[PDB]
């Protein structure tokens with residue numbers, strides 16, 4: 001690799017980071033949008049105030065403003081559902097470690113309630129909240145309301161650092177390695193500039209995902225993150241070994257690889273900054289399918305990339321990985337649904353199943369009420385789109401289990417529901433090839449009516465090759481496609497994936513059978529469960 005390849009391609013100009021003139025040739029259309037107007041100005045210079053006043057029909061009449069609502073607003077966590085819910089915006093938060101409060105939950109519920117049939121909310125595969133139904137004129141007030149309850153939506157989509165994932169049992173599990181909350185909190189504060197915006201990390205070549213591991217279970221899925229912090233002692237000191245480059249895409253899925261780097265615990269933010277600066281400064285900005293950080297690592301080689309991280313560390317020091325980490329390979333992933341004792345004597349947490357992560361305003365208020373009456377006003381989200389309510393005095397559990405809402409959001413649903421994960425799909429997402437959430441519930445219910453089983457089989461449904469619901473991690477994965485019935489009629493279908501493993505012995509699943517009509521999936525899945533997962537016909 002030539003020395004010229006290592007010239008930083010972006011520069012700071014008036015508080016923002018822009019592509020240098022000499023590197024602007026051959027860039028993709030999204031890069032052109034960022035050059036034409038800095039997206040962060042919508043927040044940091046309050047550009048949103050005037051934009052929100054313009055009728056959407058008028059906005060659509062000029063490239064600049066249409067790009068504002070369709071592209072730049074994703075820097076403020078706002079996603080125009082142009083195709084499937086025109087004029088409405090999904091809104092996505094920062095929620096490090098999946099931690100929310102009852103007050104925040106009630107606020108979000110009050111927003112979606114206003115929108116009636118156009119509103120609802122979802123737990124995401126990054127243990128995050130999304131709300132739906134937002135209209136542009138309401139955005140300035142919603143931004144204010146979020147701030148008032150201690151939430152930000154900054155930098156949650158597009159070419160930004162995505163939600164920092166941690167251990168859903170952080171601080172409460174007798175078996176945790178290290179509480180991940182301080183680290184994911186620090187990362188979120190760094191990324192968002194303490195909720196003011198951080199332009200230094202908002203002009204990346206592409207999205208970038210971090211997680212901090214604190215569980216032997218590896219609930220955080222470090223193998224599929226762009227940066228994963230693996231807890232490790234080195235020379236008598238606590239810190240993290242670093243894995244880099246994990247990602248999924250339509251074109252390519254790759255597991256994270258060792259950077260061959262260890263940092264002391266206090267260097268979590270400095271090394272996040274160094275890695276992001278290297279990616280920002282040096283990443284390819286052509287074909288969008290070749291812009292994720294792993295592509296830079298392949299171009300430079302991992303050692304070449306490591307040197308770029310090292311030069312961006314304070315005092316330019318980056319230690320080599322510790323030979324061993326603290327994650328025990330002898331481990332069985334633990335079910336977190338149901339009632340479990342905390343490490344604080346006399347307290348329990350309860351894991352509640354949220355069917356395909358979907359909630360309405362009334363449901364959110366109920367969950368917030370439970371967290372206040374039984375817990376400490378805290379609700380935790382999980383990457384399987386479920387919830388945990390921690391800090392419940394164990395003597396209250398008997399009463400809690402009789403709460404009517406637990407018949408819908410159950411601490412002990414059937415085993416296949418426990419592991420079911422589904423993306424948004426075509427109800428709202430314009431990329432979706434099929435409907436996911438309703439279909440996956442229907443099929444799973446029918447399958448479980450036919451077979452019983454004891455193995456915790458994890459089924460993931462995703463609506464298109466973007467694989468937001470991570471079909472490559474599933475025991476059985478379903479990727480949306482269009483296919484044909486026996487008469488040659490167009491029908492919704494799924495490509496069925498097998499072979500995904502999580503935890504320390506992780507593995508990426510691959511397509512097993514293409515183009516199965518959705519109406520034909522039940523018998524296929526029933527047979528797979530009996531033949532490969534020990535299920536027994538009822």
Ligand code: SRM
Nearest residue numbers: 090124125126128247248249422423424428429466467468
């Ligand atoms: C909500 C969520 C799925 C869910 O139901 O839980 C989701 C939903 C969307 N994803 Fe995703 N992604 C979600 C996690 C993922 C993950 C899983 C993960 O992070 O562990 C992946 C695969 C892992 C990865 O990217 O490395 C993922 C891969 C993508 C991709 C393909 C990325 C690529 O490099 O090609 C796109 C399209 C893109 O970015 O170009 C995408 C784009 C989208 C958009 C924003 C597309 C759009 O504007 O319509 C989807 C919004 C639909 C909607 O209205 O909800 N989404 N997306 C997840 C939100 C996470 C969060 O809170 O931040």
Ligand code: SF4
Nearest residue numbers: 423429432463464468
């Ligand atoms: S996998 Fe496809 S259909 Fe599902 S939310 Fe992501 S982009 Fe939309």
Ligand SMILES: [Cl-]
Nearest residue numbers: 074157158159
């Ligand atoms: Cl996006």
Ligand SMILES: [Cl-]
Nearest residue numbers: 081082083430
């Ligand atoms: Cl769309």
Ligand SMILES: [Cl-]
Nearest residue numbers: 157162207468
């Ligand atoms: Cl996404």
Ligand SMILES: [K+]
Nearest residue numbers: 354357384385
């Ligand atoms: K769920």
